[PDB]
Motif scaffolding. Structure first.
Motif, PDB file in Angstrom:
ATOM      1  N   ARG A   1     -12.007  -5.416   2.499  1.00 52.21           N
ATOM      2  CA  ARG A   1     -11.638  -5.460   1.093  1.00 52.21           C
ATOM      3  C   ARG A   1     -10.891  -4.203   0.680  1.00 52.21           C
ATOM      4  NH1 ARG A   1     -16.321  -6.994  -2.964  1.00 52.21           N
ATOM      5  NH2 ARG A   1     -15.664  -9.054  -2.210  1.00 52.21           N
ATOM      6  N   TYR A   2     -11.333  -3.049   1.164  1.00 45.13           N
ATOM      7  CA  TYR A   2     -10.784  -1.774   0.742  1.00 45.13           C
ATOM      8  C   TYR A   2      -9.689  -1.269   1.661  1.00 45.13           C
ATOM      9  CZ  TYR A   2     -14.718  -1.686  -2.427  1.00 45.13           C
ATOM     10  OH  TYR A   2     -15.625  -1.991  -3.413  1.00 45.13           O
ATOM     11  N   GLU A   3      -9.117  -2.138   2.497  1.00 39.55           N
ATOM     12  CA  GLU A   3      -8.031  -1.709   3.367  1.00 39.55           C
ATOM     13  C   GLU A   3      -6.745  -1.484   2.595  1.00 39.55           C
ATOM     14  OE1 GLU A   3      -8.509  -0.992   6.615  1.00 39.55           O
ATOM     15  OE2 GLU A   3     -10.613  -1.542   6.347  1.00 39.55           O
TER      16      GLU A   3
ATOM     17  N   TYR B   1      -6.700   0.191  -0.069  1.00 42.94           N
ATOM     18  CA  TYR B   1      -6.836   1.533  -0.607  1.00 42.94           C
ATOM     19  C   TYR B   1      -6.895   2.598   0.477  1.00 42.94           C
ATOM     20  CZ  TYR B   1      -8.078  -1.115  -4.763  1.00 42.94           C
ATOM     21  OH  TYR B   1      -8.074  -1.994  -5.819  1.00 42.94           O
ATOM     22  N   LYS B   2      -6.733   2.221   1.742  1.00 43.44           N
ATOM     23  CA  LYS B   2      -6.795   3.170   2.852  1.00 43.44           C
ATOM     24  C   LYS B   2      -5.384   3.631   3.212  1.00 43.44           C
ATOM     25  CE  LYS B   2     -11.080   1.372   4.741  1.00 43.44           C
ATOM     26  NZ  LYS B   2     -11.732   0.681   5.886  1.00 43.44           N
TER      27      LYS B   2
ATOM     28  N   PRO C   1      -9.020   7.285   7.055  1.00 45.99           N
ATOM     29  CA  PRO C   1      -9.471   7.233   5.663  1.00 45.99           C
ATOM     30  C   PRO C   1     -10.947   6.896   5.561  1.00 45.99           C
ATOM     31  CG  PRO C   1      -7.427   6.042   5.925  1.00 45.99           C
ATOM     32  CD  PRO C   1      -7.936   6.317   7.297  1.00 45.99           C
ATOM     33  N   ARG C   2     -11.491   7.119   4.371  1.00 44.21           N
ATOM     34  CA  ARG C   2     -12.882   6.791   4.111  1.00 44.21           C
ATOM     35  C   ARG C   2     -13.051   5.283   3.956  1.00 44.21           C
ATOM     36  NH1 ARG C   2     -11.899  11.210   0.982  1.00 44.21           N
ATOM     37  NH2 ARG C   2     -11.498   9.858  -0.823  1.00 44.21           N
ATOM     38  N   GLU C   3     -14.300   4.857   3.787  1.00 49.03           N
ATOM     39  CA  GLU C   3     -14.546   3.437   3.577  1.00 49.03           C
ATOM     40  C   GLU C   3     -14.464   3.056   2.106  1.00 49.03           C
ATOM     41  OE1 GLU C   3     -16.582   5.317   5.428  1.00 49.03           O
ATOM     42  OE2 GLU C   3     -16.222   4.595   7.470  1.00 49.03           O
ATOM     43  N   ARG C   4     -14.741   3.989   1.196  1.00 45.02           N
ATOM     44  CA  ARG C   4     -14.557   3.773  -0.237  1.00 45.02           C
ATOM     45  C   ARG C   4     -13.632   4.856  -0.779  1.00 45.02           C
ATOM     46  NH1 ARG C   4     -18.375   0.211  -2.274  1.00 45.02           N
ATOM     47  NH2 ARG C   4     -19.127  -1.057  -0.517  1.00 45.02           N
TER      48      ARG C   4
ATOM     49  N   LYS D   1      -3.317  -5.059   6.259  1.00 41.33           N
ATOM     50  CA  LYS D   1      -3.400  -3.667   6.661  1.00 41.33           C
ATOM     51  C   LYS D   1      -2.035  -3.194   7.134  1.00 41.33           C
ATOM     52  CE  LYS D   1      -5.506   0.179   7.442  1.00 41.33           C
ATOM     53  NZ  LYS D   1      -6.557   0.297   8.480  1.00 41.33           N
ATOM     54  N   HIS D   2      -1.675  -1.971   6.756  1.00 41.32           N
ATOM     55  CA  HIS D   2      -0.387  -1.420   7.138  1.00 41.32           C
ATOM     56  C   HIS D   2      -0.353  -1.116   8.630  1.00 41.32           C
ATOM     57  CE1 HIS D   2      -1.826   2.759   7.615  1.00 41.32           C
ATOM     58  NE2 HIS D   2      -2.670   2.430   6.655  1.00 41.32           N
TER      59      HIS D   2
ATOM     60  N   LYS E   1     -20.186   6.074  10.222  1.00 40.68           N
ATOM     61  CA  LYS E   1     -19.694   4.848   9.614  1.00 40.68           C
ATOM     62  C   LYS E   1     -19.854   4.819   8.100  1.00 40.68           C
ATOM     63  CE  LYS E   1     -18.436   3.300  13.551  1.00 40.68           C
ATOM     64  NZ  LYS E   1     -16.993   3.156  13.887  1.00 40.68           N
TER      65      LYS E   1
ATOM     66  N   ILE F   1      -6.103   9.906  -1.398  1.00 40.08           N
ATOM     67  CA  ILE F   1      -4.813   9.804  -0.730  1.00 40.08           C
ATOM     68  C   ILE F   1      -4.129   8.522  -1.181  1.00 40.08           C
ATOM     69  CG2 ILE F   1      -3.628   9.626   1.445  1.00 40.08           C
ATOM     70  CD1 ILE F   1      -5.932  11.173   2.717  1.00 40.08           C
TER      71      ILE F   1
ATOM     72  N   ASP G   1     -19.392   8.096   6.402  1.00 40.65           N
ATOM     73  CA  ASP G   1     -18.630   9.303   6.064  1.00 40.65           C
ATOM     74  C   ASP G   1     -19.386  10.194   5.074  1.00 40.65           C
ATOM     75  OD1 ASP G   1     -16.575   8.771   7.818  1.00 40.65           O
ATOM     76  OD2 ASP G   1     -15.345   7.721   6.339  1.00 40.65           O
TER      77      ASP G   1
ATOM     78  N   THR H   1       0.806  -1.214   0.000  1.00 45.05           N
ATOM     79  CA  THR H   1       0.000   0.000   0.000  1.00 45.05           C
ATOM     80  C   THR H   1       0.842   1.266   0.000  1.00 45.05           C
ATOM     81  OG1 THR H   1      -0.120  -0.032   2.407  1.00 45.05           O
ATOM     82  CG2 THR H   1      -1.874  -1.119   1.205  1.00 45.05           C
TER      83      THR H   1
END
Ligand code: CDL
Ligand code: PC1
Ligand code: PC1
Ligand code: 3PE
Ligand code: 3PE
Ligand code: MYR
Lengths: 171, 459, 62, 111, 122, 87, 65, 155, 79, 13, 165, 177
Positions: free
Chosen positions: L92-94, L96-97, L173-176, B418-419, F82, J7, F84, B350
């Motif tokens: 799933r989207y971690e 992209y966070k 970060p956001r969720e999407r 996860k980082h 939850k 980001i 946003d 990531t």
């Protein structure tokens, strides 16, 4: 090209096109399209390149190693003679490797070419392959990674003692 | 071989007369020129080895190890110039002198025509490596690791000295070219049993053999990055080179003296791969992976078929490049998180995507993905050990399963998930780091195109 | 520049690969080895002019 | 012979060309998924011709075009077996992959 | 598939063993029994490259069908008649195999009745 | 795909679900209507209201948060926190 | 125009997707009935399975003793 | 990090046990070490041998991928009990009942494949017949030898 | 922008299987409070979905009509 | 409209 | 198998996208009309999977059953093959029942939409494949064995009877 | 059991968690909505029967055998929401966070691509580094001796002061993404 004797091919027999239907096959039209769009420009560029080759011709030669005395007529621990004998033996070993490769190529080419009747129509290539693998296995198998002419001569002497003993006990 | 020894010695005034901001660039440039020049050793012939002088020669075994050795020096200078940036100028020149001097010892170690010259150079390679580990190592354990590294090798090699001087008194010579023609069979006796042990145990320590490998996950871990690169890439392969020379003389006694060591290495490649499954230290995981890979090279030398020697020299070159790149990737994360704990920095794909691509390719070469020369050497060793005994395919396949498991476990642990939240000094990848990764990986991939120059004297 | 894909991705690779196969692969023995064409009763051989004799007349079943 | 082997190798080289395209990039692409979908559609088209001229005769060949290595008796060559299995599986896999990628341009769009 | 029940849940002394049958001679019960004539020549089905499973006694219809299939390209629905001729002659060969099965089963019945009549007489 | 949620739309959907619940009359209901103090509901009713919110918006509210959402404004604020919303 | 999402009710359909779905279901049933008309043997049977019990002994060679 | 924050030898006095329990950031009554059989655990706590999958996924962990907190004493086999690895979570069926049903199903299926191998099905036909002495030359037979004549008859 | 939600009064459970559920609950003195929340699923366009033989026989009418037309066309084409 | 900033790590190097 | 199984996954993914990353069949239903094209192609792929006559799955699976019956075979392997053939029909109509038929169980914000020509064309080409590819390939491949076409009528009608059961 | 605020679970919380798990696993067992609604009212009746139970020992025993009831009658693959843990779209989207501090390491040529975003980010970073020392001294004056007893964080009390330890909650970060 190549020499047709060492890489034999039985002569091609393609049948004449005898179409029963009326719908034109796409293969002849794609073959004419291939000939016009692909094969003629490739042939023109190859003819240009072959003219440029013909402007300046020069040659390379096959290196001829004359036969030096082999390991049997070299003295024990005489490095100047048995070095030449060992180099001769290693070149002969590498050439015999490529001979087995040529016969494997004949066998596999026969299997693909004869297609479905390959078990009947490739009996001569299978026989030649069995003979040359028998000779190669009697000559160079089980020598080890530190192989030499001394190892191969010792293997030959052991085999000839076994053959002489078997012929002696059969009489 | 003097045209390579003389420029390597001229790297010493090149590193001591350089300007204080130029001592990395000049040594990197001229060691790259020496590495370009190394390719003249590919003048090999199917019958004769390239025999230079009374002192030096190079067959097709020593030639890839030479090109890998002369290629490893600029990459060690690139890897080691960031963490030695704040060093004193004189101590920096001493580090570069130890690297240059270790290369100087290695390039006339592999080309030694006579075996006691091989022994002198072979044990001369301890001293710059020992100085590098115990001086520029990072943690407390570098002194103990230098003790283990010194006193396993000398304990193994001082019987080797008596063995070689005995061969010198018996055969009259330790020239390897003369011993190719004056080799006598070594029959079964207790004298020849200990002759075999004295000729082999030094190289068994240097490979390392399983059970004698305990110098290695401390010397490879507690070294700096240039020390880890040279130890993983060349100094384990000194043992396999010495085995492939010295097993000329040990026939036919090797055909039953090899059994305990074949059992040790066939079971050590299972046990050290299993150890790699449960490592917390990433650098120790790469160390035990090196033990697991060199176990196959030991088995391939001890069964001494042509396919086994071809696979062993291919696997030595492939493992040198792959393990050097894995240590450099480990250093690229250690210079950011300042810890060798593998579970600490997670999710790094990531953050560093191209560095994660380098992680992916080094983990694929570690698991022997075809058509890499990793798989070529792995596969030829498996062919020859199957022809040795048909039941060794169980151990080879189980080793390949565990090898894929720890390779991709390393990849998933460091790069995926996860980082880590509390780590925020993850810089982007420097051009030096990516260039180091590419100069490891791109020769390793180009050697898949024309692999015949790394398959040894009997390709 | 509307059909540049069928030029640059087919018509240049068919040229390159046909040049390669015609003057470097088929110039070497057994590289391109082809299964021989299937011969039926009734066929005429192009290389010979030889006509294959047909089958025996069938003991007709229906 | 010349059409069969040429379109055989052109199918595989055409499939390798977008790998060179994605590796030799500087810009953000003008719809690289459309490029790979168009490439696989055209590779399906290219692979249909050796399949048709196998359905005509049963024409099979081996393309051992590149000698890679010779381990003393094992000449390893880059060798392509163009038989019934390749001729019937390559267009099926290309047709399916073409439909999967046009599905992927919709499903994996927000990625 | 009732013959499986007759061989397994019954006795095998009256049911034929399929790996080794015919156990009886082919002339035992046949005065001047004619042979199976092969129509397709050995070199003809060698040149036609038929599969060795397909080189049975009715290879000639298969050769005619493959010739029509090659000659009627691309009209792949043009040679159903040759295909049905080959399928019909394969059906007749399958009926011949069923006749071999029933012949062996009835001669095992004959041997069983013979030995039971012999055990009743002597 | 997935149109964005607004606080107006979330509040409308939450009050829409609670107006379709027979133990709450719609003419009393507001965003500050506490379920036990004002609407007089049981804790079983609050668990069922949270499960209807989960079935409405398509995500699970955990029980440490589900035991605390005791007015519709808290529920809308939690779904905002939850999801946003108002980016 | 695209599709606007609805709430608790049946969504907006396009005429195109409905006529395509109907056309391919009709193509499926037309193909099934057409091939069942013309072939009719890949399902039910190609050739009549003969009865071995109704076979005589003279055609099978069973001499009576 | 320093000396008295590193693990030590096995605790024997209760004040050494209390100092170790303070060291591993946990209660003295909850601190149990591994038993001193000399295996090499020292004073390291024997945590209750659960996977990280059983940890509360809705709690705001310091390491959300690992379901682990900062300063929390890790399990000895934390690399083993990650969610990429060995799971110890409670299963809807008992472990022994799962093992009995799976072993019985696999054993019954292998026994029935052996029975069906011993009692194979087939069709009421003879062997498939072939011309030219059961295809002698086609099956790779040498032409210098002459096979026994295999003659098939009409029926 | 503003997505206008429909009436909440229009989702009454009379005529649905929720009515049968509330009858079989009121037989023992139980009453269901979430039926109007579930009532949209069984009303409007989602009411009266097909069976499984109605699902398989989608397009059977037009397909059988096309089959009749094609058989008639080949019977008129042979002559 | 209402485009959101994404980001992502530094892709320049 | 390639055509209809790729199309079954594509139809399932169309359902997953239209129901907001929902992959569970217990939160589906009523998609017979809300997703008519996905419903059509999923029914066609399920029929080709179960061995509906003269679709693409027929020309392979019917021959597999009619050749596994009429051969010197492990009988328990054949019986488990036929039980598997019945189970294929059972889980295919499980897919059709819970995913398509019945009443909606998905959440209340209907963002059902299969109107992209990428989705429509990508399902359409494998739909033409799932209708015609068995016929086309079975008539274009040459004979490589001798097909068993004579068998008793309970043994010819095995696959269809077991699938209907 | 395990909560950030409390040290335990009350009896009432255990009963509510049981009731929610039972309705969710029942909904997994009872797929169709009318049938689930019927059996969910039956389950609501079974919970309302022993509702007004003032004997804590009797209520604890009924809770325990109701857990045994639930364990014997749970769905083996219960319905999990997709972003819920266990679900098919969970975490799933971690990938992209990307955290907020990765924007600090950008080259200035790609910070020049978004001038207003980074110009508006610098006032957030300024606001955080002036809020920090005040919120530290806010935490040290309110927390008792021996450290905090619970993981609860106190809110901001003055005006102009931000809540303590707010940065990695606000700038998550956001969720999407
Ligand atoms: C002598 C002339 C030779 C000419 C031909 C050269 C032949 C190959 C040489 C080496 C090729 C690989 C090097 C580039 C990749 C590494 C860096 C990277 O990540 O770049 C991504 C980057 C594009 O990605 P990005 O999105 O911008 O950023 C990366 C992402 O952040 C994140 O990245 P990502 O994860 O998205 O992308 C990484 C991706 C991830 O994908 C994978 O990792 C999957 C790969 C494995 C499975 C598939 C392959 C399996 C094996 C089959 C292929 C080989 C045999 C084929 C033949 C037929 C069968 C016999 O990998 C690839 O795309 C690699 C493509 C090529 C694969 C080659 C095999 C690598 C696998 C490991 C070893 C396998 C055995 C050895 C094979 C050796 C073959 C020669 O690429 C570039 O910008 C390219 C830079 C320049 C590359 C030059 C390579 C050659 C240099 C040689 C110099 C000297 C000779 C002169 C010739 C020069 C020709 C150009
Ligand atoms: C890594 C650590 C361990 C390293 C182990 C190294 C190998 C182990 C065995 C080494 C044996 C000693 C060297 C033998 C050299 C053989 C030369 C020779 O001519 O041999 C034939 C000669 C034969 O005698 P000869 O040559 O005089 O006679 C001519 C030959 N015959 C007999 C046929 C007439 O062997 C010997 O003289 C003795 C050999 C054995 C010596 C045993 C003493 C050493 C015991 C093992 C010590 C191992 C290391 C321990 C310390 C480790 C660190 C703390
Ligand atoms: C876009 C760039 C493409 C080229 C554009 C520019 C040229 C334009 C078109 C003309 C074509 C070029 C001229 C003709 C080509 C050269 C002809 C020739 O004789 O070349 C010499 C030879 C042909 O083989 P050869 O048999 O003559 O030589 C082999 C060399 N010895 C004998 C020493 C071993 O080499 C090539 O053609 C190289 C091309 C190789 C292509 C395949 C690469 C495979 C990559 C993966 C490697 C790993 C696989 C491992 C497994 C293999 C299987 C076991
Ligand atoms: C764990 C640490 C890491 C690993 C370090 C290395 C471990 C292995 C090193 C030693 C390997 C074993 C010894 C050599 C085995 C090969 C065959 C052999 O010699 O077997 C021992 C011998 C068997 O008898 P045999 O060989 O028939 O005797 C006639 C000998 N001329 O047996 C006998 O005659 C009986 C026993 C004799 C004494 C054995 C011990 C001394 C010799 C080895 C040192
Ligand atoms: C004709 C012959 C036919 C023979 C057929 C049968 C032969 C094989 C018999 C079974 C052997 C293999 C199966 C056992 C190992 C399975 C390992 C595995 O799949 O691990 C997956 C596991 C997580 O899986 P899961 O629980 O599904 O995750 C859901 C989300 N948590 O992931 C983890 O927990 C991570 C695990 C990482 C470490 C793995 C350690 C185990 C490695 C096993 C090596 C086996 C080597 C076998 C060698 C055989 C040689 C002949
Ligand atoms: C004897 O019955 C020969 C047929 C093969 C063995 C029995 C196969 C039984 C299963 C197939 C038919 C099923 C009828 C419902």
């Amino acid at each position: 090209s190549w020499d047709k004797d060492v890489y034999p091919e039985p002569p091609r027999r393609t049948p004449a096109p005898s179409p029963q239907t009326s719908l034109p096959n796409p293969i002849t039209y794609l073959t004419k399209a291939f000939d016009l769009l692909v094969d003629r420009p490739v042939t023109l560029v190859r003819e240009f390149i072959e003219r440029q080759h013909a402007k300046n011709k020069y040659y390379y030669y096959h290196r001829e190693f004359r036969r030096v005395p082999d390991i049997t007529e070299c003295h024990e621990k005489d490095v100047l003679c048995m070095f030449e004998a060992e180099m001769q033996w290693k070149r002969d070993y590498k050439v015999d490797q490529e001979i087995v490769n040529i016969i494997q190529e004949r066998l596999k080419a026969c299997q693909q070419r004869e297609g479905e009747s390959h078990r009947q129509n490739c009996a001569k290539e299978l026989q030649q392959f069995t003979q040359v693998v028998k000779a190669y296995q009697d000559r160079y198998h089980d020598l080890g990674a530190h192989y030499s002419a001394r190892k191969c001569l010792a293997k030959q002497k052991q085999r000839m003692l076994a053959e002489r003993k078997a012929t002696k006990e059969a009489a | 071989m003097l045209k390579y020894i003389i420029p390597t010695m001229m790297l010493m005034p090149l590193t001591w007369l350089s300007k204080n901001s130029m001592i990395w660039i000049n040594t990197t440039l001229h060691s790259l020129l020496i590495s370009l020049t190394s390719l003249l050793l590919l003048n090999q012939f199917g019958d004769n080895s390239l025999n230079f002088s009374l002192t030096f020669f190079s067959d097709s075994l020593s030639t890839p190890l030479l090109i890998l050795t002369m290629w490893l020096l600029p990459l060690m200078l690139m890897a080691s110039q960031h963490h030695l940036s704040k060093e004193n100028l004189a101590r920096k020149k001493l580090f570069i002198s130890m690297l240059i001097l270790l290369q100087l010892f290695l390039i006339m170690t592999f080309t030694a025509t006579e075996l006691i010259f091989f022994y002198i150079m072979f044990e001369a390679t301890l001293v710059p490596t020992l100085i590098i580990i115990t001086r520029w190592g990072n943690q407390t354990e570098r002194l103990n690791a230098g003790l283990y590294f010194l006193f396993y090798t000398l304990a193994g090699s001082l019987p080797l000295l008596v063995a070689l001087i005995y061969i010198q008194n018996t055969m009259g010579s330790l020239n390897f070219l003369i011993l190719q023609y004056w080799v006598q069979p070594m029959p079964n006796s207790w004298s020849n049993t200990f002759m075999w042990l004295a000729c082999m145990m030094a190289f068994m320590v240097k490979m390392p053999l399983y059970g004698l490998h305990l110098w290695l996950p401390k010397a490879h871990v507690e070294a700096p990055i240039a020390g880890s690169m040279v130890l993983a890439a060349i100094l384990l392969k000194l043992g396999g080179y010495g085995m492939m020379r010295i097993t000329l003389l040990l026939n036919p006694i090797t055909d039953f003296m090899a059994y305990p060591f074949i059992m040790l290495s066939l079971w050590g490649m299972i046990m050290t791969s299993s150890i790699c499954l449960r490592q917390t230290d990433l650098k120790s995981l790469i160390a035990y992976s090196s033990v697991s890979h060199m176990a196959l090279v030991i088995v391939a030398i001890l069964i001494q078929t042509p396919w086994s020697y071809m696979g062993a020299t291919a696997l030595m070159i492939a493992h040198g490049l792959t393990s050097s790149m894995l240590f450099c990737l480990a250093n690229s994360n250690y210079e950011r998180v300042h810890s060798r704990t593998m579970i600490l920095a997670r999710g790094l794909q990531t953050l560093l995507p191209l560095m994660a691509a380098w992680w992916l390719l080094a983990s694929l070469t570690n698991l022997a993905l075809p058509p890499s020369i990793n798989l070529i050497g792995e596969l030829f060793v498996v062919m020859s050990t199957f022809s040795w005994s048909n039941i060794t395919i169980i151990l080879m396949g189980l080793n390949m399963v565990i090898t894929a498991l720890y390779s991709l476990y390393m990849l998933i642990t460091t790069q995926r998930g996860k980082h880590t939240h509390h780590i925020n000094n993850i810089l982007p990848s420097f051009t030096r780091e990516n260039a180091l990764m590419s100069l490891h990986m791109l020769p390793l991939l180009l050697l898949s195109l024309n692999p015949k120059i790394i398959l040894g004297p009997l390709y | 520049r509307h059909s540049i894909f069928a030029f640059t991705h087919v018509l240049i690779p068919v040229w390159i690969i046909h040049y390669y196969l015609k003057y470097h692969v088929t110039t070497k023995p057994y590289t391109i080895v082809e299964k021989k064409p299937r011969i039926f009763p009734g066929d005429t051989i192009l290389e010979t002019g030889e006509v294959i004799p047909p089958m025996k007349e069938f003991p007709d079943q229906h | 012979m010349n059409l069969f082997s040429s379109l055989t190798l052109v199918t595989l080289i055409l499939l390798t060309m977008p790998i060179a395209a994605i590796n030799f990039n500087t810009h953000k692409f003008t719809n690289y998924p459309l490029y790979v979908k168009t490439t696989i559609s055209c590779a399906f088209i290219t692979s249909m011709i050796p399949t048709m001229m196998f359905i005509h005769t049963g024409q099979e060949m081996i393309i051992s075009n590149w000698h890679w290595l010779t381990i003393q008796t094992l000449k390893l060559s880059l060798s392509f077996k163009m038989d019934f299995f390749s001729m019937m599986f390559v267009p099926v896999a290309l047709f399916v992959t073409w439909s999967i990628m046009e599905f992927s341009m919709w499903y994996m769009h927000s990625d | 598939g009732a013959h499986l029940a007759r061989r397994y849940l019954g006795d095998a002394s009256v049911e034929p063993e399929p790996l080794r049958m015919p156990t009886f001679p082919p002339d035992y019960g046949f005065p001047e029994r004619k042979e199976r004539e092969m129509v397709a020549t050995q070199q003809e089905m060698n040149d036609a490259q038929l599969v060795l499973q397909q080189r049975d006694y009715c290879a000639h219809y298969l050769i005619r069908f493959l010739k029509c299939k090659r000659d009627s390209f691309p009209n792949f629905l043009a040679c159903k008649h040759e295909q049905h001729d080959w399928d019909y002659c394969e059906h007749l060969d399958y009926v011949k195999r069923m006749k071999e099965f029933e012949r062996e089963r009835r001669l095992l019945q004959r041997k069983k009745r013979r030995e039971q009549r012999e055990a009743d007489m002597a | 795909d997935a149109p964005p949620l607004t606080l107006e739309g979330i509040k409308d959907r939450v009050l829409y679900v609670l107006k379709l619940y027979d133990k709450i009359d719609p003419e009393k209901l507001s965003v500050n209507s506490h379920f036990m103090k004002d609407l007089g509901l049981d804790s079983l009713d609050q668990v069922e209201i949270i499960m209807a919110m989960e079935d409405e918006f398509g995500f699970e509210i955990p029980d440490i948060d589900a035991e605390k959402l005791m007015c519709p404004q808290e529920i809308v604020d939690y779904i905002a926190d939850k999801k946003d919303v108002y980016e | 125009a695209h599709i606007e999402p609805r709430y608790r009710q049946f969504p907006q359909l396009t005429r195109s997707q409905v006529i395509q779905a109907e056309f391919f279901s009709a193509t499926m049933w037309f193909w099934i009935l057409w091939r069942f008309w013309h072939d009719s043997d890949a399902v039910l049977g190609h050739f009549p399975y003969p009865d071995p019990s109704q076979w005589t002994d003279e055609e099978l060679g069973i001499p009576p003793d | 990090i320093t000396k008295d924050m590193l693990p030590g030898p096995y605790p024997k006095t209760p004040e050494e046990r209390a100092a170790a329990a303070k060291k591993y950031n946990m209660r003295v009554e909850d601190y149990e070490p591994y038993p001193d059989d000399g295996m090499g655990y020292g004073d390291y706590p024997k945590l209750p041998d659960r996977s990280q999958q059983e940890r509360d996924p809705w709690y705001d962990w310091d390491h959300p991928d690992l379901r682990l907190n900062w300063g929390e004493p890790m399990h000895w086999d934390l690399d083993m009990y990650i969610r990429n690895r060995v799971d110890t979570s409670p299963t809807p069926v008992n472990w022994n009942l799962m093992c009995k049903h799976l072993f019985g199903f696999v054993a019954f299926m292998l026994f029935m494949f052996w029975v069906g191998e011993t009692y194979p099905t087939y069709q009421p036909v003879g062997p498939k017949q072939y011309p030219y002495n059961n295809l002698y030359l086609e099956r790779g037979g040498d032409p210098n030898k002459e096979p026994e004549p295999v003659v098939h008859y009409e029926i | 922008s503003k997505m206008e939600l429909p009436d909440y009064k229009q989702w009454k459970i009379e005529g649905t299987p929720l009515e049968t559920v509330q009858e079989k609950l009121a037989a023992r003195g139980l009453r269901d409070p979430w039926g109007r929340n579930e009532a949209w699923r069984y009303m409007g366009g989602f009411a009266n979905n097909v069976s499984f033989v109605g699902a398989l026989l989608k397009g059977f009418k037009w397909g059988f009509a096309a089959f009749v037309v094609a058989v008639g066309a080949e019977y008129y084409l042979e002559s | 409209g209402k485009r959101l900033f994404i980001i992502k790590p530094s892709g320049f190097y | 198998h390639a055509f209809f199984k790729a199309m079954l996954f594509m139809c399932s993914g169309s359902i997953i996208h239209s129901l907001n990353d929902e992959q569970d069949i217990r939160k589906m239903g009523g998609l017979f009309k809300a997703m008519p094209f996905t419903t059509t192609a999923l029914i066609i792929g399920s029929l080709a999977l179960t061995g509906m006559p003269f679709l693409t799955g027929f020309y392979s699976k019917d021959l597999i059953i009619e050749s596994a019956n009429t051969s010197y075979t492990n009988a328990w392997a054949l019986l488990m093959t036929l039980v598997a053939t019945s189970f294929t029909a059972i889980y295919s109509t499980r897919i059709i029942f819970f995913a398509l038929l019945g009443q909606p169980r998905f959440p209340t914000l209907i963002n059902i939409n299969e109107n992209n020509p990428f989705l429509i064309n990508s399902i359409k080409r494998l739909l033409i494949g799932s209708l015609f590819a068995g016929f086309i390939i079975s008539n274009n491949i040459p004979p490589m064995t001798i097909p068993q076409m004579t068998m008793p009528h309970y043994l010819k009608m095995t696959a269809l009877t077991v699938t209907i059961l | 059991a395990f909560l950030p605020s409390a040290a335990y679970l009350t009896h009432q919380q255990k009963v509510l968690q049981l009731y929610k798990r039972a309705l969710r696993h029942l909904e997994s067992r009872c797929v169709h909505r009318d049938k689930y609604r019927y059996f969910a009212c039956l389950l609501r009746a079974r919970f309302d029967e022993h509702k007004n139970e003032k004997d804590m020992v009797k209520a604890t025993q009924l809770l325990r055998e109701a857990e045994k009831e639930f364990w014997h009658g749970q769905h083996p693959q219960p319905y999990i929401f997709p972003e819920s843990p266990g679900g098919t779209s969970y975490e799933r989207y971690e990938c992209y966070k990307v955290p907020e501090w990765c924007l600090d390491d950008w080259h200035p040529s790609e910070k020049a691509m978004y001038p207003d975003y980074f110009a508006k980010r610098e006032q957030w970073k300024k606001l955080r580094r002036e809020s920090w020392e005040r919120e530290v001294k806010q935490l040290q004056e309110e927390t008792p001796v021996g450290g905090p007893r619970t993981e609860a964080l106190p809110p901001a009390r003055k005006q102009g002061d931000l809540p303590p330890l707010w940065w990695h909650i606000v700038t998550r970060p956001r969720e999407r993404p």
